[PDB]
Amino acid sequence: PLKIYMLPFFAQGHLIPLVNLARLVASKNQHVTIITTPSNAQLFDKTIEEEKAAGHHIRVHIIKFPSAQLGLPTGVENLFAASDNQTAGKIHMAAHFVKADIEEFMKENPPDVFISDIIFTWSESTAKNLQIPRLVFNPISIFDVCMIQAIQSHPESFVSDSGPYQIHGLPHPLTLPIKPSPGFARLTESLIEAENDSHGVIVNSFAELDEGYTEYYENLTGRKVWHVGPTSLMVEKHQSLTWLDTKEPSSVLYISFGSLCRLSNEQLKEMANGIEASKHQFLWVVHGKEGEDEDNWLPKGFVERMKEEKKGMLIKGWVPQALILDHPSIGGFLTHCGWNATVEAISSGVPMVTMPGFGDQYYNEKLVTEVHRIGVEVGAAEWSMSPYDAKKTVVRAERIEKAVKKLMDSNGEGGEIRKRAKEMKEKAWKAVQEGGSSQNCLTKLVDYLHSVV
């Protein structure tokens, strides 16, 4: 059994995929330690207790979050607790400050293998000075870094002031309506750089989804890709459901952007008009609007006609999203294309209507709509690097209405996309089931680590 230390970054889209990888590797009779901070460990300690109770050798080593060095108040230890770019940048800076406590812990208790999130750039020098193999963990598909690199390597394609823009050199032709904003290629230098006797990159995706981009990346960097994901699938009555029980199969568009990527008042109004003009049934979940005048973010009397024509339901608060996406009445998912939303949509076979909000979501959109055609693209109006900055432009209602109609209408393109989405669901569960690509690759990874030690 190997001694494997796993270092997640302090963000939910990074933390939970790496924790799930930790549960998978522990389930293969390995000694796994997750190194994290107190507020983050309490997001999954109950799962760890259940794994320990099943005989799996998995534990959490607590390190102090550098709140004092950053001037952050206690309990602000992940991006979900940040509310502005300054705080978000400080949490990114925290990845550098934890280096001393982690290096000290590893010089005293050296493990056999060190697995660290892409962000901890110091992990390379730490593994060399301790003479220990290190693998990088990428919590999303390898397609994103490929799209980024293709953009970076073709600056002549983005010289025009107005789009569309062509992305060349990839397995698929890709287009962008808006050019990437300065700094779009952050947190990729560790992934794009060539190999220096690399043990590979662990990728939270599956081979079928990344097909072609796996080879593009390996050819570009020389580094092996280990597809072991989606790890959230590998480790496997609310009034909304009651309303859905009255609707025809695949007849309801589910709309949810969550809390981080919540839309502006002007954007919510454009959305309601486009959704209403689409004439399709909808389940719209909005966060952070309880006790606010609906006229501030909805058209006049939107909710009145919404219930009179029996078209839509608007929920202000938390909904069981996993059960909603599994309900047969849902026929579409309008969302921001975050990785977790993308994986959940795939796992439920639900086609997406893509409206990316910030960051990696513009690349996730293209994987969904232009590579795999398991969703429909609304059309971005602004490229934002941050979820907290207010957008100077808005996605107009006709674009939202046209995209919903394109997916939800029967006689057209939506039938193919709906069928492709159902087939990707089967491919995703097959990859994580017994004998699937990601289960086989996880076994080969652990075997390879044994021969490296």
Ligand X SMILES: O=c1ccn([C@@H]2O[C@H](COP(=O)(O)OP(=O)(O)O)[C@@H](O)[C@H]2O)c(=O)[nH]1
Give the span between the Cα atoms of 116 and 403, in whole angstroms.
39
Maximum C-alpha span of the chain: 69
Question: Hey, what long-range contacts does 190-195 have (CB within 8 A, 24 or more apart)?
Answer: 190/118, 190/121, 190/124, 190/136, 191/118, 191/136, 191/138, 191/145, 191/221, 192/145, 192/148, 192/149, 192/220, 192/221, 193/221, 194/221, 194/222, 194/223, 195/221, 195/222, 195/223
Active site residues: 14, 117
In the 3-class helix/strand/coil scheme, how is 214-265 assigned residue by residue?
HHHHHHHHCCCEEECCCHHHHCCCCHHHHHHCCCCCCCEEEEECCCCCCCCH
Do 350 and 254 form a contact (C-beta atoms < 8 A)? yes
Q: Provide the β-strand partners of residue 334.
A: 255, 353
The residue of the chain with the least Cβ separation from ligand X equals: 258
Q: Is 256 annotated as a binding residue?
A: no
- Residue 322 in contact with ligand X, rule: CB under 6 A: yes
Q: Is 57 annotated as a binding residue?
A: no
From ligand X, Cl ion, none, which one binds at residue 111 (CB under 5 to 8 Å depending on kind)?
none
List the interface residues with ligand X, window 233-262 (CB under 6 A). Answer: 258-261
Stretch in the footprint of Cl ion (CB under 5 A) among 35-43, 158-166, 399-407, 434-442: 434-442
Q: Is 318 annotated as a binding residue?
A: yes
Give the span between the Cα atoms of 199 and 133, in whole angstroms.
7
From ligand X, Cl ion, none, which one binds at residue 232 (CB under 5 to 8 Å depending on kind)?
Cl ion
Q: Is 287 annotated as a binding residue?
A: yes
Answer for which of 379, 385, 440, 448 binds Cl ion (CB under 5 A) is: 440
State the binding string over 379-408 for Cl ion (x if CB under 5 A, else -): ------------x-----------------
List the interface residues with Cl ion, window 255-274 (CB under 5 A). Answer: 263-264, 267
Residue 295 vs residues 64, 266, 442: alpha-carbon distances, Å: 45, 11, 52
Q: Which two tokens stand for residue 119?
A: 């962000």
- Residue 275 in contact with ligand X, rule: CB under 6 A: no
- Residue 230 in contact with ligand X, rule: CB under 6 A: no
- With respect to Cl ion, which residue has the nearer C-beta, 111 or 230? 230
Residue 95 vs residues 10, 89, 115, 257: alpha-carbon distances, Å: 8, 10, 14, 27
From ligand X, Cl ion, none, which one binds at residue 312 (CB under 5 to 8 Å depending on kind)?
none
From Cl ion, ligand X, none, which one binds at residue 267 (CB under 5 to 8 Å depending on kind)?
Cl ion
Do 141 and 161 form a contact (C-beta atoms < 8 A)? no
CB of 258 to ligand X, least distance (A): 2
- Residue 229 in contact with ligand X, rule: CB under 6 A: no
CB of 340 to ligand X, least distance (A): 5
**Among 2, 37, 3, 4, residue whose Cα is nearest residue 21:** 4
- Residue 319 in contact with ligand X, rule: CB under 6 A: yes
- Residue 318 in contact with ligand X, rule: CB under 6 A: yes
From ligand X, Cl ion, none, which one binds at residue 391 (CB under 5 to 8 Å depending on kind)?
Cl ion
From Cl ion, ligand X, none, which one binds at residue 328 (CB under 5 to 8 Å depending on kind)?
none
Q: Which two tokens stand for residue 430?
A: 């097959």
- Residue 203 in contact with ligand X, rule: CB under 6 A: no
Give the span between the Cα atoms of 223 and 226, in whole angstroms.
10
List the interface residues with ligand X, window 86-145 (CB under 6 A). Answer: none
List the interface residues with Cl ion, window 214-243 (CB under 5 A). Answer: 230-232
The binding site consists of 259, 287, 318-319, 321, 340, 344
Binding site for Cl ion (CB under 5 A): 17, 230-232, 263-264, 267, 343, 391, 437, 440
Binding site for ligand X (CB under 6 A): 12, 258-261, 285, 318-322, 338, 340-341
